[PDB]
Amino acid sequence: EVETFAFQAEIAQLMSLIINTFYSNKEIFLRELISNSSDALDKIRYESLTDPSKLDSGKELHINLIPNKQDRTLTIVDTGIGMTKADLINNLGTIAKSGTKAFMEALQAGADISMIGQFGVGFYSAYLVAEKVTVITKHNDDEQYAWESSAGGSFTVRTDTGEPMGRGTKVILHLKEDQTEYLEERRIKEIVKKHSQFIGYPITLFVEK
Ligand SMILES: Cc1cccc(NC(N)=S)c1
């Protein structure tokens, strides 16, 4: 059972701007998503200080980067707090509405796309390099869900029946045909070193077989 939803108008407008604006500095998408993973790890780490049982679904706090040249995907996995169904459908977008409005006004006044994370909506920078984004996620308080969008104004949410995840979020970037540099081991290492060197969790770049 798959449910289809319209993005809020402001968010569809932002994703169209991200997809259609000429902007060569696309590598910042990786910084934004690692930053989001780090925040999610911070949250479950803090919650576990007063309720240790929150780590029953997995004690390791880490980020894995998994390029796949055959599928042309780059996957960013974290074992952070995860997202509920309400997060995916309503809560995160409600928050994103005001950050989007502020980011688009800032762009009008001279900001550039790389400051997108200062407005809390860096997630959407995934569409700099991906034609489709799938997000698999499991929060301690909810079931495992898959969120997916190729932009165009809509997204889907379904119960996920793939491999159980324990807890956390997996962002699967289905890369555009001309963006396969982000599957190359040395390019990814360069970007992580440049932008994410001080992230406080182990980042493991998987190599392909
Ligand atoms: C995976 C997903 C679902 C709904 C909203 C968002 N947006 C941000 N996180 S700003 C992301």
Task: Summarize the topology.
Blueprint: E1 2-6, H1 9-20, H2 28-50, E2 63-68, E3 73-78, H3 85-108, E4 130-138, E5 144-149, E6 154-159, E7 168-175, H4 185-195, E8 203-205
Residues 88, 92-93, 96, 121, 123, 135, 147 line the site of N-(3-methylphenyl)thiourea.
Region (Interaction with NR3C1): 1-209
Modified residues (N6-acetyllysine): 43, 69
Keywords: Acetylation, ATP-binding, Cell membrane, Chaperone, Cytoplasm, Host-virus interaction, Hydrolase, Membrane, Mitochondrion, Nucleotide-binding, Nucleus, Phosphoprotein, S-nitrosylation, Stress response, Ubl conjugation
Written overview of the protein:
Keywords: Acetylation, ATP-binding, Cell membrane, Chaperone, Cytoplasm, Host-virus interaction, Hydrolase, Membrane, Mitochondrion, Nucleotide-binding, Nucleus, Phosphoprotein, S-nitrosylation, Stress response, Ubl conjugation. The chain is α+β, with helices and mostly antiparallel strands and 209 residues long. The chain has a single domain, classed as Histidine kinase-like ATPase, C-terminal domain (Heat Shock Protein 90, 2-Layer Sandwich). Helix content is 33%, strand content 23%. It contains 4 helices and 8 strands, in the order βααββαββββαβ. The chain has helices at residues 9-20, 28-50, 85-108, 185-195; strands spanning 2-6, 63-68, 73-78, 130-138, 144-149, 154-159, 168-175, 203-205. A hairpin with a 4-residue loop joins β2 (63-68) and β3. It starts with a strand and ends with a strand.
Short description:
This protein has 209 residues and is an alpha+beta fold.
